[PDB]
Amino acid sequence: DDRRDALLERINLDIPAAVAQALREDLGGEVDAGNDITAQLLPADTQAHATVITREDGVFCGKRWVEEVFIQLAGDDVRLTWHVDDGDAIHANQTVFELQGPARVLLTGERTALNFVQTLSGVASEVRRYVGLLAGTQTQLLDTRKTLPGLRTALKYAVLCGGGANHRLGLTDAFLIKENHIIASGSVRQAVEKAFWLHPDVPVEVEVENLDELDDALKAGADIIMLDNFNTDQMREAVKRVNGQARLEVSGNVTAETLREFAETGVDFISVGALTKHVRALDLSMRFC
Amino acid sequence: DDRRDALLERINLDIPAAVAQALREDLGGEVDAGNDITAQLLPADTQAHATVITREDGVFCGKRWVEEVFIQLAGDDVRLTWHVDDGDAIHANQTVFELQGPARVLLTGERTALNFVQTLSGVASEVRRYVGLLAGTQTQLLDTRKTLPGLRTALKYAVLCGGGANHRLGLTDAFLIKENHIIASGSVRQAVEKAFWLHPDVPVEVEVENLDELDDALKAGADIIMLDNFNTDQMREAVKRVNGQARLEVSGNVTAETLREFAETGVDFISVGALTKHVRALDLSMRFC
Ligand SMILES: O=C(O)c1cccnc1C(=O)O
Ligand SMILES: O=C(O)c1cccnc1C(=O)O
């Protein structure tokens, strides 16, 4: 699969585009470090060195965004000293990285730098706790397209650092056949045929609602099949008749302990939307030694 | 105060860009609705009628954002039907708005329009929860500069819709002097003083760690003073000694009930970042008929 390399490229091209904007909203439309009024109260060479410390256990994510924010503002002039990486388990009070550079800048860059990290890390921390219960199982967590507008790619990254796998990037890289769709084409068969013909190289998923609808999907050549409302028993039986090509995705947006039962049934994937549609930002701060 | 104007005028510009942002991440690069591949398997004319609905009581917010997704995908080819207005009581299973238009479109714009509403309405709903504990006092709830990257204004707007007040929108429209600044200036008096010399018109707020610095800055003429770390009693006596020009702000992301006791003291503003750094999307679905 290349989606990993497809994601990895897209975020690189997207990080500056977003960081640019985050700083723009803070500095009144323009990205000029001098626009910070309150910072003007310091002599333009007063050197400084702060430290960012997490105040709760979690998982780190957001390194690339940080480096970018200061780069935009005063590249080469602010040195960074990381203690952790984009996927590490962080402990309460553990200091995450230190900053070196002109006072004015650190103060301006503070908010935006922390805002990116609190978010991405908040999400990455949530994902892991979610993936923690699928241990000793051969089932995998997954994301959706229910993300905060703008942070699409970045959230898929944090989901990644959290320990989950990603789903289609959007409407472009994958087919998600549904009831409406199956009706328009006449059959599942005819549906996945016109699909595999529209754009040959993309994967096709057909949404099934019952065990029988699922057979017609298997034989159809659909590489992934999501089940909408099957109970522990039907899921278990479903898997049993699939095997090869058996790419089952359960939309298990539901409860914590239910997660365990689903995974238990050997179903390939469990997509959770709550992972990227809500954010409990990690508690962080920048102290000045 | 013109902040409302400055705000509503910024969003007026920010919305088309933000709708265009999410409409690109999902359509792999460009706002070309034809990019949705699964949509191609559908009859290019079959109109439909979709109804959005929330599964929970809260507050609405997002109309101009929704109105912009669909215009942007099919200028005047889709018709919306509004029941609630931005900042209105929403009721479990209440119909929010309807959609009349081509199904190929309604399907694509679905996810993007809904993410906006889920987020904004999610935030707005919880601000109402907060302002609702302030009935009786003269205390104004404020936001901070702790917002998810990109949605600075959208969240500042959603905050109004909930009942809260807007604190500055960036580093460029007011002074917020913390210990760090106070250090280089020499003292507190000297810092406020110096601030007034540079930018004569933009409001000046200084953060004070104790009573000596309180009246020390009060006499210097600042307009709002942030009381950092005051316990109940000290806050109460501070309210006292200020009286005139008593724009006393107390950043209190402390807790649901200790929040009341604070405002009780008769302090002016309580800025809670907890409102825009965390997102608990509102549960809505857009069902077909
Ligand atoms: O479109 C998707 O990728 C998707 C796939 C799995 C579950 N839901 C979604 C969604 O965004 O609603
Ligand atoms: O103006 C601010 O930046 C602000 C306003 C009051 C409280 N907090 C903040 C903050 O972002 O830390």
Curated annotation (Swiss-Prot), chains A, B:
Keyword annotations of the record: Glycosyltransferase, Pyridine nucleotide biosynthesis, Transferase
Domain of life from the UniProt record: Bacteria
Catalytic activity: nicotinate beta-D-ribonucleotide + CO2 + diphosphate = quinolinate + 5-phospho-alpha-D-ribose 1-diphosphate + 2 H(+)
Any one GO molecular-function label of the UniProt entry: nicotinate-nucleotide diphosphorylase (carboxylating) activity
Disulfide bonds: none
Function of the molecule: Involved in the catabolism of quinolinic acid (QA).
Protein's recorded name: Nicotinate-nucleotide pyrophosphorylase [carboxylating]
Source organism (scientific name): Salmonella typhimurium (strain LT2 / SGSC1412 / ATCC 700720)
Gene: nadC
